[PDB]
Amino acid sequence: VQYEWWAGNARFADQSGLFIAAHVAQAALTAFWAGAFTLFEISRFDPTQAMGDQGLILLPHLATLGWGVGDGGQIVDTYPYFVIGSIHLIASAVLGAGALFHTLRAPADLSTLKGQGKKFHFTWENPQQLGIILGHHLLFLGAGALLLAGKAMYWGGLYDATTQTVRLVSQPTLDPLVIYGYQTHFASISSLEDLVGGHIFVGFLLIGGGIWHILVPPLGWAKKVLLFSGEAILSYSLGGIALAGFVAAYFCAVNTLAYPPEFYGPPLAIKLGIFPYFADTVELPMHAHTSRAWLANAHFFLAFFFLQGHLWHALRALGFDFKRVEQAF
Amino acid sequence: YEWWAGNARFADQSGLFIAAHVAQAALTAFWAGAFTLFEISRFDPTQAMGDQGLILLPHLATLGWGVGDGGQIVDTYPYFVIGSIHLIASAVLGAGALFHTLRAPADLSTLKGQGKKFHFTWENPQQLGIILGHHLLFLGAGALLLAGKAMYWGGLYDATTQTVRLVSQPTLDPLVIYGYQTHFASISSLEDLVGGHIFVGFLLIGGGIWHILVPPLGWAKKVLLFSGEAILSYSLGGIALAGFVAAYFCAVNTLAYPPEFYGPPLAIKLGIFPYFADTVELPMHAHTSRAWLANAHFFLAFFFLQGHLWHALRALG
Ligand code: CLA
Ligand code: CLA
Ligand SMILES: CC1=C(/C=C/C(C)=C/C=C/C(C)=C/C=C/C=C(C)/C=C/C=C(C)/C=C/C2=C(C)CCCC2(C)C)C(C)(C)CCC1
Ligand SMILES: CC1=C(/C=C/C(C)=C/C=C/C(C)=C/C=C/C=C(C)/C=C/C=C(C)/C=C/C2=C(C)CCCC2(C)C)C(C)(C)CCC1
Ligand SMILES: CC1=C(/C=C/C(C)=C/C=C/C(C)=C/C=C/C=C(C)/C=C/C=C(C)/C=C/C2=C(C)CCCC2(C)C)C(C)(C)CCC1
């Protein structure tokens, strides 16, 4: 088959080197937006005023971790933001280095190699090596969860918005029955110590899922209840990231504990006119909104559009290319 | 190759390569010495050294030769003798350039004496490893020359107390040198500058001894391309990155060298094109020497990034 130049990235479906290269380049663009815009939207910051009114977009996430804040919720420094931005710069540098190295120098078909590349070629009809890739990615996401768990033990703990202190969390929960009953108490637990205690359980859960995916492949029913094509696997990933975007918009709307209210903004209100959105209780006159409303709304619309993309790839994968032509006789 | 790619003709000869490079070295030393001698004549002692657009005399003012106490100028004879030694060195390098064009042959394979171990190609790794190690040895020699000029041959100028201070008690631990990546644009002290310079002097002389004493292994020959335009691409990307970070270094650092020789601290401006501007105004509408240097080094570094891009496209397929 042939694809036009307006949409021609489907040629990454069989070529594996470009499949690695374009995605690592995309991650390089994400890390470049993380590093560059932190060091570029720093001149808009003023510690005399608040953080919710000026429209700071990146720096709320850095003050969430509890690096350069103390008693009362005030910012007296920039140097932790400087070192996190700088490690994001050099991480984007090395990640774009590997990206363009795979784009320009590495071969496209990984099965035509001689060293440790022919054992690295993937395709869309195996449950074993794709399960190995899923296991390694689950290991790395669980390692990020381990880093979130160690943030509450290494650098003085996370930031608390109730007690206005960067306190060290040293009380882990030794019971998963509280974790079962959290489905009513979503973003209403009124405790910052239970968030890390829920993070160690899901972190060890991610390690166990990665161990299960490395050790054993899909044992037979996933070949029947699921598909392995690129459009179908793209559909599953886009549905997962759309559910993540919707629950992140809900956490940016209602929580006001992990996100500090004096930095991000006030608790929001769920409204619906033409489209459903979130509005501040304290409006701003200069056609501006807080970081809460901006983040929650933008992640809601992006999660909706990626749910529509998931439905598009699901219709593309399951043979429904163009079958609504038979409406009119 | 007809008159518009003319330097690429002797790229494969590798006998007049040496002549072109020592001619370029002669031109750089000529510009250095002759423009110190030029800017000595157009120098005002009463006015500040940045408002009249002076580059190399403030660059020698960091070394503390022709300056005193309070930001003033004691004399111009150290700048004069430094530019004079640079001019005589450019004369002998241009003499060596005319030597290597005329009396030296087009290829070093015709030579039969003791200089036959100087011929280099684009095929063997050990020769260019020896060249890289000797150049790293000379860079470490320049770093220990700065160490000697800082400790046992003179003092430095500090922007903190505004004097020429012979700096003792340098940085002696490798922890804070590892941590100076976090704050490199603001060194915030000159004792850390000289201590880290002795640290990187030891580091680069260790890399030089490691390079000449150990031949290349072979794990990078299958990854990196061993062509002339490829090594030109690697060095061009290195010097373009160094020029960009040196321009950003010049834009904000007001105490690696003191700012009374350059003017106000430069401010960034990011619009359709990035450029650095001052805060005060000058009646000539001429920007300060720091404002000339940082903007020119940023634009030359960006054009060198594009040149390394073009040479890396030409080196690949
Ligand atoms: C992880 C996400 C992801 C990935 C990998 C893909 C991958 C793919 N999609 Mg796709 N898609 C996604 C998300 C994704 N999509 C979402 C979220 C939507 C809903 C909005 C769609 C809607 C969609 C359609 C409708 C079609 C595809 C098609 C394709 C395939 C062809 C290559 C391509 O992208 O065309 C590259 C195409 C472009 C770059 C578009 C051309 C330029 C446009 C005009 C600019 C972008 C418009 C936008 C408004 C710009 C502003 C951005 C805004 C955020 C500010 C390719 C396999 C096509 C297909 O099936 O194969 C032919 C196809 O027809 N996708
Ligand atoms: C020190 C760095 C360096 C080195 C050693 C080289 C070396 C080389 N380049 Mg090159 N290049 C560089 C940087 C460098 N380049 C940069 C930064 C760029 C981007 C602008 C380019 C763009 C470039 C192109 C587009 C081409 C080369 C080519 C070549 C090769 C042949 C050169 C020749 O005789 O024709 C080069 C041409 C001339 C010498 C004559 C025209 C040059 C004009 C007169 C210069 C005018 C600029 C002006 C005086 C400076 C203003 C600055 C201001 C401060 C005053 C040679 C190997 C050619 C090649 O690969 O062969 C096919 C080729 O086509 N280069
Ligand atoms: C506690 C806590 C926490 C945690 C959390 C967690 C732990 C979570 C989990 C989560 C989870 C754990 C989830 C789950 C989900 C699930 C789902 C979502 C699924 C889906 C699936 C699918 C979709 C599939 C299906 C199928 C099959 C099976 C076959 C047939 C067909 C189909 C395909 C349909 C936090 C951090 C917040 C903090 C606080 C507290
Ligand atoms: C190879 C070649 C080339 C190149 C060459 C060159 C360019 C050269 C250079 C050369 C040089 C560049 C030289 C220089 C010289 C100079 C001189 C020789 C000067 C003198 C002076 C001095 C040394 C001193 C100083 C002084 C004093 C001390 C006192 C007062 C007065 C005065 C200031 C004078 C060309 C391109 C052409 C062509 C092709 C080939
Ligand atoms: C801060 C400071 C300092 C220091 C400095 C230093 C110590 C530096 C270092 C630096 C460093 C030490 C650097 C490094 C760099 C490196 C580079 C820049 C690289 C890159 C590369 C790339 C990116 C590529 C990649 C690759 C490879 C590697 C292999 C093959 C493949 C490829 C090509 C891909 C001082 C003392 C002066 C004083 C005070 C301030």
mmCIF file of N, CA and C and ligand atoms in Angstrom, chain A residues 93-102, chain B residues 176-189 192-201 203-204 219-220 223-224 234 237-238 241 249 253, ligand 5:
data_model
loop_
_atom_site.group_PDB
_atom_site.id
_atom_site.type_symbol
_atom_site.label_atom_id
_atom_site.label_comp_id
_atom_site.label_asym_id
_atom_site.label_seq_id
_atom_site.Cartn_x
_atom_site.Cartn_y
_atom_site.Cartn_z
ATOM 1 N N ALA A 93 19.249 16.648 25.817
ATOM 2 C CA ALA A 93 20.403 16.599 24.923
ATOM 3 C C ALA A 93 20.793 15.162 24.586
ATOM 4 N N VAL A 94 20.956 14.314 25.609
ATOM 5 C CA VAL A 94 21.384 12.937 25.344
ATOM 6 C C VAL A 94 20.255 12.128 24.694
ATOM 7 N N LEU A 95 18.999 12.452 25.009
ATOM 8 C CA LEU A 95 17.887 11.710 24.436
ATOM 9 C C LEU A 95 17.677 12.081 22.970
ATOM 10 N N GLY A 96 17.826 13.366 22.627
ATOM 11 C CA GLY A 96 17.839 13.755 21.228
ATOM 12 C C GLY A 96 19.055 13.254 20.477
ATOM 13 N N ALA A 97 20.181 13.072 21.178
ATOM 14 C CA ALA A 97 21.364 12.479 20.560
ATOM 15 C C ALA A 97 21.090 11.056 20.102
ATOM 16 N N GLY A 98 20.551 10.226 21.005
ATOM 17 C CA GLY A 98 20.148 8.879 20.620
ATOM 18 C C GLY A 98 19.046 8.861 19.575
ATOM 19 N N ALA A 99 18.155 9.856 19.626
ATOM 20 C CA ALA A 99 17.060 9.978 18.669
ATOM 21 C C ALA A 99 17.563 10.188 17.248
ATOM 22 N N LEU A 100 18.346 11.245 17.036
ATOM 23 C CA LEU A 100 18.850 11.504 15.696
ATOM 24 C C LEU A 100 19.914 10.498 15.274
ATOM 25 N N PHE A 101 20.588 9.837 16.226
ATOM 26 C CA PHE A 101 21.482 8.744 15.861
ATOM 27 C C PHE A 101 20.701 7.569 15.288
ATOM 28 N N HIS A 102 19.533 7.273 15.861
ATOM 29 C CA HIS A 102 18.692 6.234 15.280
ATOM 30 C C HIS A 102 18.039 6.695 13.986
ATOM 31 N N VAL B 176 32.574 19.823 45.126
ATOM 32 C CA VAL B 176 31.978 21.082 44.705
ATOM 33 C C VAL B 176 32.303 21.377 43.242
ATOM 34 N N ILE B 177 33.366 20.778 42.700
ATOM 35 C CA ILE B 177 33.622 20.872 41.266
ATOM 36 C C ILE B 177 32.572 20.084 40.488
ATOM 37 N N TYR B 178 32.144 18.938 41.029
ATOM 38 C CA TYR B 178 31.016 18.217 40.444
ATOM 39 C C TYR B 178 29.725 19.014 40.590
ATOM 40 N N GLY B 179 29.581 19.743 41.697
ATOM 41 C CA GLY B 179 28.384 20.530 41.934
ATOM 42 C C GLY B 179 28.327 21.866 41.224
ATOM 43 N N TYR B 180 29.435 22.318 40.642
ATOM 44 C CA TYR B 180 29.445 23.585 39.919
ATOM 45 C C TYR B 180 28.767 23.512 38.555
ATOM 46 N N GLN B 181 28.326 22.327 38.122
ATOM 47 C CA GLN B 181 27.442 22.241 36.964
ATOM 48 C C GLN B 181 26.083 22.861 37.261
ATOM 49 N N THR B 182 25.661 22.827 38.526
ATOM 50 C CA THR B 182 24.377 23.401 38.911
ATOM 51 C C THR B 182 24.393 24.922 38.815
ATOM 52 N N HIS B 183 25.500 25.555 39.203
ATOM 53 C CA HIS B 183 25.673 27.001 39.060
ATOM 54 C C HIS B 183 27.017 27.249 38.379
ATOM 55 N N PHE B 184 27.014 27.231 37.047
ATOM 56 C CA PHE B 184 28.209 27.548 36.276
ATOM 57 C C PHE B 184 28.189 28.956 35.710
ATOM 58 N N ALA B 185 27.001 29.498 35.427
ATOM 59 C CA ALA B 185 26.904 30.855 34.902
ATOM 60 C C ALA B 185 27.260 31.891 35.958
ATOM 61 N N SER B 186 27.107 31.545 37.233
ATOM 62 C CA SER B 186 27.523 32.389 38.348
ATOM 63 C C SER B 186 28.484 31.570 39.203
ATOM 64 N N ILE B 187 29.789 31.768 38.988
ATOM 65 C CA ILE B 187 30.789 31.074 39.793
ATOM 66 C C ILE B 187 30.800 31.617 41.214
ATOM 67 N N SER B 188 30.439 32.896 41.382
ATOM 68 C CA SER B 188 30.235 33.636 42.632
ATOM 69 C C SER B 188 31.487 33.793 43.497
ATOM 70 N N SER B 189 32.645 33.339 43.015
ATOM 71 C CA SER B 189 33.927 33.456 43.700
ATOM 72 C C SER B 189 35.039 33.115 42.719
ATOM 73 N N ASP B 192 37.255 29.654 43.772
ATOM 74 C CA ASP B 192 36.704 28.473 43.122
ATOM 75 C C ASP B 192 37.084 28.411 41.652
ATOM 76 N N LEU B 193 37.210 29.570 40.994
ATOM 77 C CA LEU B 193 37.630 29.611 39.595
ATOM 78 C C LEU B 193 39.046 29.069 39.432
ATOM 79 N N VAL B 194 39.987 29.558 40.247
ATOM 80 C CA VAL B 194 41.365 29.094 40.093
ATOM 81 C C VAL B 194 41.528 27.659 40.596
ATOM 82 N N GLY B 195 40.793 27.264 41.643
ATOM 83 C CA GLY B 195 40.884 25.892 42.120
ATOM 84 C C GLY B 195 40.305 24.890 41.140
ATOM 85 N N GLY B 196 39.151 25.214 40.552
ATOM 86 C CA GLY B 196 38.609 24.386 39.497
ATOM 87 C C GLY B 196 39.451 24.402 38.240
ATOM 88 N N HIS B 197 40.208 25.479 38.008
ATOM 89 C CA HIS B 197 41.090 25.482 36.848
ATOM 90 C C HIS B 197 42.297 24.575 37.058
ATOM 91 N N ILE B 198 42.836 24.515 38.282
ATOM 92 C CA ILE B 198 43.877 23.517 38.552
ATOM 93 C C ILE B 198 43.298 22.102 38.498
ATOM 94 N N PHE B 199 42.044 21.934 38.937
ATOM 95 C CA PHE B 199 41.381 20.633 38.866
ATOM 96 C C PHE B 199 41.209 20.171 37.420
ATOM 97 N N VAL B 200 40.728 21.057 36.546
ATOM 98 C CA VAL B 200 40.573 20.668 35.150
ATOM 99 C C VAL B 200 41.914 20.628 34.432
ATOM 100 N N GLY B 201 42.941 21.305 34.948
ATOM 101 C CA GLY B 201 44.276 21.118 34.408
ATOM 102 C C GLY B 201 44.776 19.706 34.632
ATOM 103 N N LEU B 203 42.788 17.180 35.175
ATOM 104 C CA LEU B 203 41.864 16.316 34.439
ATOM 105 C C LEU B 203 42.256 16.213 32.966
ATOM 106 N N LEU B 204 42.566 17.348 32.340
ATOM 107 C CA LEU B 204 42.893 17.329 30.921
ATOM 108 C C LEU B 204 44.301 16.804 30.661
ATOM 109 N N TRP B 219 36.026 0.027 19.501
ATOM 110 C CA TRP B 219 34.585 0.023 19.715
ATOM 111 C C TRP B 219 33.908 1.254 19.127
ATOM 112 N N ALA B 220 34.651 2.337 18.913
ATOM 113 C CA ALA B 220 34.096 3.553 18.338
ATOM 114 C C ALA B 220 34.315 3.653 16.836
ATOM 115 N N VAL B 223 31.145 2.755 15.192
ATOM 116 C CA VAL B 223 30.065 3.700 15.452
ATOM 117 C C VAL B 223 30.370 5.021 14.761
ATOM 118 N N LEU B 224 31.503 5.627 15.105
ATOM 119 C CA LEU B 224 31.893 6.896 14.509
ATOM 120 C C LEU B 224 32.547 6.676 13.150
ATOM 121 N N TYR B 234 32.660 16.473 13.997
ATOM 122 C CA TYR B 234 32.704 16.274 15.446
ATOM 123 C C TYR B 234 33.323 17.482 16.139
ATOM 124 N N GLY B 237 30.888 20.582 15.805
ATOM 125 C CA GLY B 237 29.828 20.550 16.799
ATOM 126 C C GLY B 237 30.338 20.855 18.194
ATOM 127 N N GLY B 238 31.546 20.378 18.517
ATOM 128 C CA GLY B 238 32.144 20.701 19.804
ATOM 129 C C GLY B 238 32.422 22.185 19.977
ATOM 130 N N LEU B 241 29.033 24.163 20.213
ATOM 131 C CA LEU B 241 28.463 24.061 21.554
ATOM 132 C C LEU B 241 29.249 24.902 22.551
ATOM 133 N N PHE B 249 27.694 32.345 28.848
ATOM 134 C CA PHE B 249 28.581 32.671 29.959
ATOM 135 C C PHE B 249 28.898 34.159 29.986
ATOM 136 N N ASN B 253 27.592 36.446 33.444
ATOM 137 C CA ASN B 253 28.640 36.380 34.462
ATOM 138 C C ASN B 253 29.336 37.731 34.556
HETATM 139 C C1 LIG C 5 31.512 24.760 36.141
HETATM 140 C C2 LIG C 5 32.841 25.386 36.258
HETATM 141 C C3 LIG C 5 33.973 24.765 35.928
HETATM 142 C C4 LIG C 5 33.972 23.387 35.439
HETATM 143 C C5 LIG C 5 33.941 22.983 34.168
HETATM 144 C C6 LIG C 5 34.037 21.579 33.799
HETATM 145 C C7 LIG C 5 34.633 20.615 34.746
HETATM 146 C C8 LIG C 5 33.380 21.151 32.717
HETATM 147 C C9 LIG C 5 33.147 19.769 32.378
HETATM 148 C C10 LIG C 5 32.385 19.500 31.321
HETATM 149 C C11 LIG C 5 32.242 18.173 30.757
HETATM 150 C C12 LIG C 5 33.029 17.065 31.330
HETATM 151 C C13 LIG C 5 31.662 18.081 29.557
HETATM 152 C C14 LIG C 5 31.352 16.881 28.830
HETATM 153 C C15 LIG C 5 30.793 17.058 27.628
HETATM 154 C C16 LIG C 5 30.516 15.946 26.759
HETATM 155 C C17 LIG C 5 29.882 16.078 25.586
HETATM 156 C C18 LIG C 5 29.345 17.388 25.171
HETATM 157 C C19 LIG C 5 29.540 14.890 24.841
HETATM 158 C C20 LIG C 5 28.492 14.793 24.020
HETATM 159 C C21 LIG C 5 28.396 13.649 23.149
HETATM 160 C C22 LIG C 5 27.303 13.326 22.449
HETATM 161 C C23 LIG C 5 26.040 14.078 22.569
HETATM 162 C C24 LIG C 5 27.394 12.285 21.448
HETATM 163 C C25 LIG C 5 26.947 11.042 21.638
HETATM 164 C C26 LIG C 5 27.607 9.861 21.070
HETATM 165 C C27 LIG C 5 28.552 9.182 21.734
HETATM 166 C C28 LIG C 5 29.021 9.588 23.072
HETATM 167 C C29 LIG C 5 29.239 7.972 21.223
HETATM 168 C C30 LIG C 5 28.946 7.710 19.767
HETATM 169 C C31 LIG C 5 27.494 7.950 19.470
HETATM 170 C C32 LIG C 5 27.148 9.400 19.728
HETATM 171 C C33 LIG C 5 27.812 10.203 18.625
HETATM 172 C C34 LIG C 5 25.646 9.533 19.584
HETATM 173 C C35 LIG C 5 35.290 25.459 36.090
HETATM 174 C C36 LIG C 5 36.308 24.471 36.621
HETATM 175 C C37 LIG C 5 35.845 25.953 34.763
HETATM 176 C C38 LIG C 5 35.230 26.723 36.947
HETATM 177 C C39 LIG C 5 33.946 26.993 37.690
HETATM 178 C C40 LIG C 5 32.764 26.758 36.787
#
